[PDB]
Every structure is written in C-alpha cells, then in structure tokens.
Amino acid sequence: RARPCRVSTADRKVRKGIMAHSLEDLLNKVQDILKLKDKPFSLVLEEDGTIVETEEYFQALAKDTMFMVLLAGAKWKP
After folding, report:
1. Cβ 33 vs Cβ 62: under 8 Å
2. Which residues have CB under 8 Å from 59's CB, separation 6+?
3. How far, in Å, CA of 33 to CA of 52, rounded?
4. Closest by Cα among 52, 44, 30, 54 to 78
5. Could you give phi then psi for residue 16, rounded to 5 degrees?
6. Which residue range(s) make up the domain with 37?
7. By the 8 A CB rule, do 44 and 50 touch?
8. Whole-angstrom distance, CA of residue 51 vs CA of residue 76
9. Strands ordered across the beta sheet of 4-8
C-alpha cells in the first residue's frame, strides 16, 4: 500500500510529490526523481530536521508532511 510524500530539496528549490511504499523505497526513488548526483542517506522533516529512520514513524506521519532528503554527507539547515 503506497503513501504520498512531499519531498523538498535542501535549498527549498524544488518540491515534488512521490508515492512511496516505504522509507527504503522512497530513498530509492528520490535520487532519480529529484535529479540527485548521489543517493540520499537520510530522510528528515523539513519543519525542524527531525530524523525519519523507522518505517513506523514514516507511516505515522501526516499525508501533507513536507520531507527533506539529506544526501550522504551532512545535516539539515533551516
């Protein structure tokens, strides 16, 4: 069962809607969906940089939740 995800970039440049079956799968998709040079390593909340690293929390979040991928390196910025 898929899940709607609003994924933004670190520079708040582009926001895109992605259907994700789970966290892993989303992290698989977002690289080629958002034109990313290397695969992101962490999914974070755009609101405050809260780390989403479990499938349960990822599923429990609201459907209008704006995400923010962190690529394979360093952390969130406001």
Report:
1. no
2. 3, 22
3. 19
4. 44
5. -135, 145
6. 1-78
7. yes
8. 9
9. 15-19, 4-8, 66-70, 42-45, 51-52
Number of domains in the chain: 1
* Documented resolution in Å: 1.9
Any idea which residue has 């479990």 for tokens? 54
Is 70 in contact with 76 (CB distance < 8 Å)? yes
Residue 23: give its domain's CATH number: 3.10.20.10
Coil vs helix vs strand at 66: strand
E strand spans, the chain = 4-8, 15-19, 42-45, 51-52, 66-70
Amino acid sitting at position 24: E
Our measurement of the distance from residue 43's CA atom to the centroid of its chain's CA atoms, rounded to an integer in Å, reads 4
The experimental method behind these coordinates is: X-ray
